[PDB]
Design a protein around this ligand. Sequence first.
Ligand code: CLA
Ligand code: CLA
Ligand code: CLA
Ligand code: CLA
Ligand SMILES: CCCCCCCCCCCCCCCC(=O)OC[C@H](COP(=O)(O)OC[C@@H](O)CO)OC(=O)CCCCCCCCCCCCCCC
Ligand SMILES: CC1=C(C#C/C(C)=C/C=C/C(C)=C/C=C/C=C(C)/C=C/C=C(\C)C#CC2=C(C)C[C@@H](O)CC2(C)C)C(C)(C)C[C@H](O)C1
Ligand SMILES: CC1=C(C#C/C(C)=C/C=C/C(C)=C/C=C/C=C(C)/C=C/C=C(\C)C#CC2=C(C)C[C@@H](O)CC2(C)C)C(C)(C)C[C@H](O)C1
Ligand SMILES: CC1=C(C#C/C(C)=C/C=C/C(C)=C/C=C/C=C(C)/C=C/C=C(\C)C#CC2=C(C)C[C@@H](O)CC2(C)C)C(C)(C)C[C@H](O)C1
Ligand SMILES: CC1=C(C#C/C(C)=C/C=C/C(C)=C/C=C/C=C(C)/C=C/C=C(C)/C=C/C2=C(C)CCCC2(C)C)C(C)(C)C[C@H](O)C1
Lengths: 170, 107, 194, 181, 42, 129
Amino acid sequence: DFSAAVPFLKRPSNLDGAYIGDVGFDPLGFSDVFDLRVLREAELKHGRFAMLAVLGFIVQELYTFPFFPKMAPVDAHDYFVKQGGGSQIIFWISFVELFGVVALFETLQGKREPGDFAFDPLGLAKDEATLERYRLAEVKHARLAMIAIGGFIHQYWVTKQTVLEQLGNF
Amino acid sequence: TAVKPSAQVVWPIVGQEVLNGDVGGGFQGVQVTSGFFQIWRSSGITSEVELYWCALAGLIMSGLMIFAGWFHYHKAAPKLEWFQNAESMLNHHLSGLLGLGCLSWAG
Amino acid sequence: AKSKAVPFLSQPEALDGSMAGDVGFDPFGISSVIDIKWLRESELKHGRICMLAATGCLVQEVVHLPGPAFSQKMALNAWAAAPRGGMISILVAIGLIEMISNRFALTATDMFANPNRVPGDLGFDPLSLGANPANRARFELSEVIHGRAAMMGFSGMVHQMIVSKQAPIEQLMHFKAVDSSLMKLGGAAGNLGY
Amino acid sequence: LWNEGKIQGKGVSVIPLFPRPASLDGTFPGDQGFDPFGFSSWVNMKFVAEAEIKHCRLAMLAFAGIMVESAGISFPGATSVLGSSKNIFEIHDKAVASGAMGQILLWVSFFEVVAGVPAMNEMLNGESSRIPGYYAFDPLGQGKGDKMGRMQLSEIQNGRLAMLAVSGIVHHTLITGKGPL
Amino acid sequence: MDSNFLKYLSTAPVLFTVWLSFTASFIIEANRFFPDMLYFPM
Amino acid sequence: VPGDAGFDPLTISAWLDSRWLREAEIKHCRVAMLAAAGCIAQDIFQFPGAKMTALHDAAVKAGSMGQMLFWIGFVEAISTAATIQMLQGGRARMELSEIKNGRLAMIGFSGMVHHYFITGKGPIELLTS
Ligand code: CLA
Ligand code: CLA
Ligand code: CLA
Ligand code: CLA
Ligand SMILES: CCCCCCCCCCCCCCCC(=O)OC[C@H](COP(=O)(O)OC[C@@H](O)CO)OC(=O)CCCCCCCCCCCCCCC
Ligand SMILES: CC1=C(C#C/C(C)=C/C=C/C(C)=C/C=C/C=C(C)/C=C/C=C(\C)C#CC2=C(C)C[C@@H](O)CC2(C)C)C(C)(C)C[C@H](O)C1
Ligand SMILES: CC1=C(C#C/C(C)=C/C=C/C(C)=C/C=C/C=C(C)/C=C/C=C(\C)C#CC2=C(C)C[C@@H](O)CC2(C)C)C(C)(C)C[C@H](O)C1
Ligand SMILES: CC1=C(C#C/C(C)=C/C=C/C(C)=C/C=C/C=C(C)/C=C/C=C(\C)C#CC2=C(C)C[C@@H](O)CC2(C)C)C(C)(C)C[C@H](O)C1
Ligand SMILES: CC1=C(C#C/C(C)=C/C=C/C(C)=C/C=C/C=C(C)/C=C/C=C(C)/C=C/C2=C(C)CCCC2(C)C)C(C)(C)C[C@H](O)C1
């Protein structure tokens, strides 16, 4: 059959709706070679980091903590490389990513969904149907935010104005 | 004609940092004799940034070759009648590998 | 069959909820390679040493034996100032305690040879405080928890004495934040040495 | 009273915007649905109930104290040694400096150490069948059915309102720089 | 982790290289922090 | 099969895939349609901030042609997936009209660019002057 997204491209054949958010889009054929659990692991991880980054880029413009000096987020990266806070964040992410390595091994061995860490403290996933719609929304937001974060950082480079101030000006 | 090429620096451990000799240009290191500096100047490199891009190009090619070896043994292995094409292989290795390679380098 | 501590991982085998402090926390699966009896001996031993050590830092800050050799508020300085002869006496006494309390079954190959031997149970109850079997389970649990808490706390106290050259509660009462110019982490290979 | 079906009881949701969860049980006093984030699914219900009643009682007593110390009302000689101001924050700081707050801290801590923690441990283990927050402290009568039916409901609601109101008062006083009354 | 990959890491050349690289590494570190130990200091 | 006038004098169809030939021809057709209609449109009216051939290098320096190359390059990567999957395995009038107008557009564009070489001018400008 044909891909739902691209009508004239054939369906990849490793993508038969097994993973939510599948629209049959995979022209370069990475699912014909590589494991889709690993690729969905990577898609959801990149997407969650990007979603947090876009929220951070905007909120950091709106507010910053009193103990830290006020500055733009790219300058924040460089300041906290030299200050020590960046190493703390890198270390704690690396610490969590150790048990993430264990989690990815559990996914490869079949006993875990690729983005599932059982992280539902506030019980928002009331029912299975609600979870399916929520994870479709998570996939769509994750992809959209990857595009968005690239835009903010690259535009900041080209025009040295922050995202809220760039919308505010021009 | 004054600075001596050096592209290897040793760590200080057991007194071995004596090997970082005064090669010139405000630098200490092991003098290298492979002629890479003269190759790079003939190429027109003129900066370390372009050497970083060449190192990345080598890393990308290295990944593509190890992928291709895996792919052509485990996923798509040619049959014997493909390898037993001496005329085709010579046509491509003379015309394509050597001739295009010389032409692209001439450009 | 998922872990209770780590809900997205499977419950590790050799962890069945029998032992006190068993919450299923073994993500790296050390218990699948190393026998759980040896691991519980080592956990109880580390924790007991740390419980005494954490109390040692705090009390050594407050109360001292007489004499100038024992007047070291900062505990990391007490190591160097306290008489060497007596410190090595402590070390030798610890070695004799280790061989006798374990009854010459000290090696990984021979300890627990006797089926009566229990992890952490050396027979130490001088005042028979564990005579009541009703209190046994919560005593075992609170010993395990005090040991874990004290491992973390002593680790913190030693490396905060390294960063700030102050005894722990005096550090709390005369607190100074890290400049970040000093105590740089790593960096031996970034500058290529020196 | 209990008023089962009308208010509290079971099946009553004060905010129909959130459906009443099935995890929540209709047998806790002053319980009316209101569990949006689903905490009752996994928390010990007796522990959080005892915690709610205890937070309620601090909130009520704290409200009574904030109002008295903001109306200028005092015990004899208290304003002589403590301040004459009516700002609750400054009174706390100078009563800390006087040792009075340390004495209250001492005796409250002693009551928790010897009585609060055993009452908690027995009530949660399942050895005493003590209902949450009960300490047999009913000197001036007022027991019987009304105490376990309407008065129990009254304690829980008046306390929740006291929590909201005291949080409100302390935040308003800090931003304005002026107290109530 | 896969048991066949862990069985590969248990092969003699891998363990030999890892063990003596670890051994070499703590001799190097001990001579970095404590260099020129010609004698046991006593 | 559409637009078959029996015109293959050198018989290229015998020694190259008919699908590859048709996809290449229809791509050439549509590109020259856009190019010729654009060629006249540039002289008719102009977008703000802004000849036939010189404008290529007047546009590359801004970065416009680099941008258009990047987006055509993206679409052409998906289109190379399309043509490989094509090759590895009341409307007929509308296709035939497309193919005829596209061949006409290739001739027209070739004409306009060489006329630019002749006179340094655009198509309808040459007609006006
Ligand atoms: C134009 C076609 C072409 C080219 C360039 C090559 C090139 C090569 N073949 Mg040959 N080969 C061809 C067709 C071609 N083959 C055909 C048709 C057959 C079937 C009969 C074979 C069968 C064949 C066998 C059986 C073997 C080779 C091997 C090799 C490699 C020789 C070792 C060497 O010098 O590599 C180093 C030199 C380089 C320049 C490295 C370049 C790497 C890439 C692949 C070159 C081409 C990239 C691309 C076309 C360039 C894009 C340019 C763009 C940026 C503008 C070399 C990569 C041998 C080998 O090593 O296999 C891996 C080998 O065992 N070939
Ligand atoms: C074979 C027996 C023996 C002998 C002859 C000595 C002889 C000596 N020791 Mg001792 N020592 C021993 C065993 C012995 N030690 C053991 C087994 C330990 C390990 C627990 C120690 C630990 C030790 C320390 C840490 C110190 C000495 C010191 C001294 C010297 C001075 C003693 C003094 O002035 O006493 C007169 C003083 C006292 C009687 C004061 C006693 C202080 C109280 C009782 C400490 C509380 C003990 C504590 C609860 C230990 C519990 C752990 C234990 C059960 C394992 C002297 C050379 C001191 C030294 O070298 O100074 C130069 C010193 O600092 N020793
Ligand atoms: C409106 C408040 C209110 C209500 C309805 C209750 C109701 C109850 N309490 Mg709780 N309690 C409260 C406040 C309240 N309490 C506070 C603040 C404390 C801390 C001092 C306590 C401490 C407490 C303990 C330790 C125990 C109870 C228990 C009980 C139950 C049996 C006792 C009884 O019925 O007598 C209640 C009688 C009355 C409420 C009569 C009214 C008296 C008023 C409230 C005093 C007002 C003080 C003052 C004038 C403040 C106003 C002025 C200010 C603004 C300046 C019943 C469910 C027992 C139980 O079964 O627990 C589950 C138990 O063991 N209570
Ligand atoms: C492929 C043919 C082609 C080419 C190479 C160009 C190139 C150019 N034109 Mg011309 N133009 C074209 C078609 C073309 N245009 C068409 C069809 C029209 C009629 C609507 C125009 C009308 C036109 C005017 C009026 C102006 C330009 C201008 C420009 C320049 C700036 C880029 C721009 O704004 O594009 C404008 C192009 C269009 C509005 C239509 C483009 C046609 C397609 C949709 C773009 C292809 C890219 C596509 C998104 C990706 C491929 C997918 C495909 C399957 C659809 C550049 C010289 C401006 C300039 O700098 O002049 C000095 C100017 O003023 N052009
Ligand atoms: C259960 C117990 C858990 C213990 C947790 C450990 C907590 C502390 C860990 C480090 C904290 C943050 C580090 C930032 C500090 C940091 O990253 O500095 C960077 C340093 C390298 O220096 P650079 O290249 O960064 O120089 C950078 C320039 O900015 C400055 O010149 O990295 C290291 O290699 C140091 C660590 C030694 C690596 C080998 C360790 C010994 C190997 C033993 C076998 C393996 C054990 C595990 C090895 C990782
Ligand atoms: C999972 C979990 C929980 C959680 C959680 C959390 C923290 C969730 C946070 C989720 C977030 C942060 C989602 C954000 C998505 C961002 C998107 C879609 C990008 C939008 C930007 C666009 C489209 C743009 C743009 C543009 C460009 C690029 C540049 C501009 O010049 C112009 C322009 C503005 C047009 C909780 C704790 C609640 C519990 C629960 O039980 C389990
Ligand atoms: C074995 C092992 C474990 C362990 C352990 C550990 C870490 C145990 C550490 C034990 C320690 C620290 C023992 C310290 C003993 C101190 C003594 C006897 C002081 C004597 C002072 C004297 C004689 C004096 C004096 C005087 C001098 C000379 C001159 C004057 O001017 C001053 C002064 C008046 C004071 C445990 C139990 C946890 C578990 C497991 O089973 C494995
Ligand atoms: C069993 C047995 C008996 C016995 C016995 C004995 C000797 C029992 C003694 C038990 C002891 C000594 C327990 C000590 C626990 C210490 C803890 C939990 C400290 C945690 C520190 C933390 C969390 C921290 C911290 C800190 C950090 C890092 C940051 C700092 O800036 C500050 C801060 C301080 C806050 C006897 C002999 C009676 C007989 C009986 O028949 C059998
Ligand atoms: C190095 C450096 C830093 C950094 C950094 C970072 C994070 C840099 C950011 C990198 C990122 C996220 C780039 C994103 C690129 C996405 C693109 C080009 C979308 C293409 C979509 C296309 C072509 C079309 C897509 C298609 C169309 C038609 C629409 C639908 C979808 C699709 C069909 C696929 C800092 C900040 C730490 C500073 C530090 O001191 C040094």
